[PDB]
Design a protein around this ligand. Structure first.
Ligand SMILES: CC[C@](C)(/N=C/c1c(COP(=O)(O)O)cnc(C)c1O)P(=O)(O)O
Ligand SMILES: CC[C@](C)(/N=C/c1c(COP(=O)(O)O)cnc(C)c1O)P(=O)(O)O
Ligand SMILES: CC[C@](C)(/N=C/c1c(COP(=O)(O)O)cnc(C)c1O)P(=O)(O)O
Ligand SMILES: CC[C@](C)(/N=C/c1c(COP(=O)(O)O)cnc(C)c1O)P(=O)(O)O
Ligand SMILES: [K+]
Ligand SMILES: [K+]
Ligand SMILES: [K+]
Ligand SMILES: [K+]
Ligand code: NA
Ligand code: NA
Ligand code: NA
Ligand code: NA
Lengths: 431, 431, 431, 431
């Protein structure tokens, strides 16, 4: 049983709480799209752990590669190179679009954003950073200074030169031009204000292609391109944080490929490490060369460690070899249609959005007023859990609660159907 | 051969440079205290990779535990608990001194410092951070804002409320009182200035027990205690960054045990993960409770991931089981005496300092003037490498170059002797 | 002649340039609504010097009071009181609306804003300041940190927690709601963004009732009230900077009286000193009491100096005694109608706005496109000068050039007519 | 009587308190070295009001010049020049040392420091400012960010890049080198720390030649020169704030003349306006030219106003014409010897320091321990007042209370003797 009193005693005595609440179960093992509690119950993992396990849990190939290296090349002095490192960097330059040439291999998502931000500052000689008002880039200093969906209060001043602009949100539009939601006009208006506040030290704009924690907000058609131009006009770099979008999830290897806009620096992490801590930034040779002449520094313990690099390479291999990017579109489409069917059945489902296998369901009181359904989201979530489906909801001011659905790229048709049934049931009991 | 032209071609084209310079060899495999290049040559690793591999490379136990978990519980939604996580947190509360009760398990050293700093700010409601002028706490925002041995220029303003004071350095004393280096008087004088600059928002002091990158500077007798009192009087927390000192390296499980001073928050990382990316903070229950009521947040992808937690637990087991803390004193003593013998033989060795198996050798022009020997350090380093010994030197303004010696806790008598011979030879050729 | 070569030689050698350009004439004397060059030519002063001389130049009463005091009570230790000081403070509490009780008498406009800002920070225990994106509050640190119409670039970072929102501008509206310029909806939208960026340290909003340097922008109907509520909901103070609007200029003793909204702190300066350097803040007793218990400090050399205080009291007397606030409406109305007649005659006049005797004329290429007429403004200005009328234009990005008209409250019907004729002529020659 | 209940009623109801406490008397008039209360009692003004009235109160010449201008050229549009302005700027270039060429005429001391600081930032392209830990430069933002003797707590973060170093204090030395107070070694040590904290954006050092509010601390022999070199090596400007030292007070026209070190920017105010609000900065032509090409801006209402400029010119004339700088040395010497005699008589007088007519007396418990005499200072001060002598004491942590003595340059032998007798008596009653 999950009730192991010694286990819960120690958990209460010895863990630091760091957000949210601990599920009242003890995860014993995990395989593929499921995890198992201490009673042996299988929970369908619709979030791929913490949005990372694109190949599912304990993927046999990952398992072999991990075994191989643990026993042969584990960790090294940060100035020593090895194959897995060079292969992975090379691999990355190759599958990213042209203009993305050189890579740096780190450990976490925030770390990858900090490295990108530091580099932008170094090459521009400026320090002001702009992000979206519902972003999430990490808990470390600079990453946090650009994170706006939460965490800003009580922890002292943010970094000097931190600015946010509203993200374009079609579902709940707030900016009109001729009885129309003109999100590009909104962009202009936003920048104008920025320009007027800047000290003249604009270094970069950092952005997620789809705001995940922000509520699965997809940047609409043309936005990105337009965004890129705003930067270029201002001599700013564009940093795209693809921690949740990269490596196939949205139906392209990388989300920026969809818009055909290549950022100056691209950052990766969650899905790249598929559960392990590996992260990266990729930039152009020109930018790298300049950072280098300027003395760019970002020296860590695990930068360029072989084991993790090895794991990342295998993940890419598998994705490619198995056409998992394409699978993402097929399963994604299967899941989306199901969600849409639920939305036919239940009024509280106000919207279903997203791409590929990174989907959002916004819970609402009523589809007409689009009024946030408070408490209801949490109910459903609990019912899912009882039913054996692991879900995640995010709640922002002025928005209904949003389920963030992100099953493994390896998920099966069945598993999709199952989740879909569990969710319907959960909604039914929760009303 | 290490000359693989395709390998070097790709390395040049696709890697981001991030400090220092790449060794011109290709590391193929690693085992115990050695690494091997592509020609099969064995290099004695006197720095334990990047100062982490306390059990050496590819330790059989680490290898099994890694295997076990990769295949059974890899990575989870950050709100789900599992045994390895609870066991490790518990284990940590138990081997740390009283007052250190609750743990948070993360991935990197900087991340662990950011979490500690954020928490200090939250519980104090203040934001000013003080560190040593030769410190190194990490490359991420806040960690970097408190890092003074390098990296401060060209990357924009540091965090608001960043202050440093001089670290007590007995080898090159600068503060006198009655013809004596009164490092405590220096401390008072330092604080007075701080007090006068503060906006009245002093939150914490962050410190390494032994400044590693700072040049292996050991806090002298009574300093720490006195430091702790300065904080307490000011309502500040004391955060001890034991990334390189923890887990046995200096001859005690933790360096603070030596002084018998328990910090408010303790951070760990390098040696705890023994090569893998695992890190942690440990605090008192009271502090944790308060952070919790205040809404402390530090939610990441890999916080509380089972695999790494599992690895950390095994590392602790092994250390304990094999009396490696005690071994650290014995080998350390064997290594220190050797260094001292070299210092008898060569004038350019100005000082040998450190504790247990974390030792420093400061290179000097002449023992009397204690004038920095410029270029000489680098020579020696290169000669070592040719000879098959991997070393590391750090160079600060106003100080001679310092070799940072940190062989695995598992290092053998032979391996020690060998390194000692290689180094003598290297110094000989380099003169 | 104005050509005095020694005079210009010295001017070139010994003055620091500090913005704009020196008129090529030598002002020898001034009286009433005119100034005289070295050739004895009379220039009609339509800006009341630098927007201050509400009683005109060298007003006989000011002249007597100045004489009186220079000879009897000039300047004192800042802890000694005298009558003029107490009378003026009292006078101020009395003519300001209820809720405005206690005064502090300083020297300049920026100084008065700094004192208000410091006090807001002290009583709220917070530090974030919000202003308008086209504001001007002064050249000193904090005042400058909240000044957005110009001066932000090249001089380092602004104060931490500086934010701006767009000012409501009816002439060139940018925010629509149902095919309408919904300036209140714009306000909401603005605040939402602020809220999301704040660290939770909102202390005050600072605002001019009519943005003078911003282009004579009048806060539309209901805005202020709504603004005040946004603050109150957030626990922020409202500081109204009435440097150019106070003391009768807009047809009420103080502009806030028109909206019937009383700010938390009111600041005055230009018109209060009528040419001399006197300035003030007025606040509620409650706010003052609290600032006092918290140790509010703002100790200067000239705070509470008798001479200037004496001058301010006389200015108020005269204004009251002569019904100059009422005169402001009558002359203002005479001037406005004239401007409107010009606008009938010339296409380049796009708008005439303002209140009482603080009027703006926006120069435009064509009334339909409302396209900024570049160069034209400057022409006109030069022609005015030749014609003997002193004018001032301000130019902001995205706006046509704006003449800022602000003749003395003592201006005569004739003088108005004259200026009106000179301006027509100037426009005629300039086309 | 000073008891006017209506007067005190209004004072209590309508004044904002801003530091310190109001003397319980009503100053009715002032003349020469005295002020008179409402009972007609004459108080000898040993602080020249608030340290400004170098020609005493109501000096007949000041009075005429003031009269002249009030009636002829009072205040102008900031872009119009006039003679008094050009004459004064010229005059200033001429009496300052070579290298000081161009002037900007403002209103207050803080304003003058803000203008200097802004300009330093503009020309260096950097923003970090260093001052003394016991300085006082003003209450406005930047001036306050560099003020360390008081006011830093409770009002939010200071300006980014604010640093202080200890001022050299011979009376209570804290830095030793070979059993000697090596204040220059202290300077080096200080800078080293600064260097290590800087982001590489050092713009200027701002300093008072004698720290007035800091406790009448005189920069010892060679310090300044050495300080200037530290700056020059770092590419920083040196700004000397001579608000209390300029215009004769210390026995030279300007204090920097004594050391023969010319700062990059010199600021003046108190004594220059001799009671009226006038202030200035003086810089080199090169610096000015560069600030100008970079768009230096510092446009205020009263910059370049004729009346005040006129007053400043007269003050200079008088000082020169009457050899008041020389008089300062003679009277200063008469006053100093008296103080020394008191120090013979009373143990509580620990030190008498200063120069010319800017003298300090530090009150101590006992001359041997040099222990601060708490409460005693305040007693004496009160007794002086009863006796008819106006004095001022400043109290800093770790220092005894310090009387700041600064009688007018026009003070008479008698007046000196008188004060000297009153003070002796006051000390006698107070023991
Ligand atoms: C000084 C650079 C070096 C990489 N040190 C890293 C380091 C970190 C950061 O850990 P990270 O986040 O990098 O994992 C935290 N605390 C201390 C005391 C450290 O020495 P090393 O000393 O090993 O060379
Ligand atoms: C929003 C909180 C969550 C943990 N996200 C983390 C996250 C990180 C940080 O990675 P880390 O440093 O934590 O590894 C970086 N960039 C994006 C777009 C993210 O969503 P998630 O979305 O998965 O719940
Ligand atoms: C220390 C407080 C006192 C008012 N000093 C004011 C002061 C100012 C400010 O001038 P302000 O802007 O105030 O006119 C600038 N520089 C120095 C060296 C000063 O001592 P004082 O010393 O006279 O008591
Ligand atoms: C905009 C530049 C001008 C000089 N304005 C100065 C100004 C000040 C500063 O007063 P200062 O400290 O300068 O005395 C404060 N508040 C407002 C609304 C102002 O317009 P003006 O509008 O008169 O041209
Ligand atoms: K490494
Ligand atoms: K996790
Ligand atoms: K005063
Ligand atoms: K002026
Ligand atoms: Na690419
Ligand atoms: Na413990
Ligand atoms: Na009132
Ligand atoms: Na000169």
């Amino acid at each position: 049983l999950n009730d192991d009193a010694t286990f819960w005693r120690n958990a209460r005595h010895h863990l630091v709480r760091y957000g949210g609440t601990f599920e009242p179960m003890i995860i014993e093992r995990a395989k593929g799209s499921f995890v198992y509690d201490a009673d042996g119950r299988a929970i369908l993992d619709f979030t791929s752990g913490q949005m990372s396990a694109v190949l599912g849990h304990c993927h046999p190939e990952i398992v072999s590669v991990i075994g191989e290296y643990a026993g042969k090349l584990d960790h090294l002095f940060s100035e020593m190179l090895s194959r897995p490192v060079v292969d992975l960097a090379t691999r990355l330059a190759n599958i990213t679009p042209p203009g993305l040439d050189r890579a740096l291999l780190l450990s976490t998502g925030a770390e990858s954003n900090e490295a990108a931000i530091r580099m932008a500052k170094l090459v521009t000689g400026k320090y002001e950073i702009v992000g979206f008002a519902q972003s999430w880039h990490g808990m470390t200093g600079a990453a946090a200074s650009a994170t706006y969906s939460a965490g800003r209060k009580g922890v002292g001043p943010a970094a000097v030169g931190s600015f946010a602009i509203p993200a374009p949100f079609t579902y709940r539009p707030r900016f009109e031009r001729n009885g129309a939601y003109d999100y590009l006009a909104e962009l202009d208006y936003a920048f104008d204000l920025i320009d007027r506040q800047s000290s003249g030290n604009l270094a970069a704009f950092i952005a997620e292609p789809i705001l995940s924690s922000g509520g699965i907000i997809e940047l609409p058609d043309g936005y990105m391109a337009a965004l890129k131009r705003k930067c270029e006009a201002r001599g700013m770099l564009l940093i795209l944080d693809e921690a949740q979008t990269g490596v196939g999830r949205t139906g392209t290897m990388f989300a920026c490929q969809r818009d055909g806009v290549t950022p100056d620096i691209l950052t990766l992490s969650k899905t790249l490490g598929a559960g392990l801590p590996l992260a990266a930034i990729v930039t152009s040779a020109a930018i790298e060369e300049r950072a280098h002449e300027l003395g760019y520094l970002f020296y860590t313990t695990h930068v360029s460690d072989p084991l993790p690099a090895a794991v990342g390479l295998r993940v890419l291999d598998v994705v490619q070899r198995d056409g998992l990017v394409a699978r993402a579109n097929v399963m994604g489409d299967r899941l989306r249609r199901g969600l849409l069917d639920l939305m036919e059945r239940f009024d509280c489902i106000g919207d279903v959005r997203g791409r590929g296998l990174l989907l959002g369901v916004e819970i609402v009181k009523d589809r007409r007023t689009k009024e946030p359904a408070d408490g209801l989201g949490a109910k459903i979530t609990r019912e899912c859990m009882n039913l054996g489906l692991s879900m995640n909801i995010v709640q922002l001011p002025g928005m209904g609660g949003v389920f963030r659905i992100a099953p493994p790229l390896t998920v099966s048709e069945d598993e999709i159907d199952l989740g879909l049934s569990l969710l319907g049931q959960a909604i039914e009991r929760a009303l």
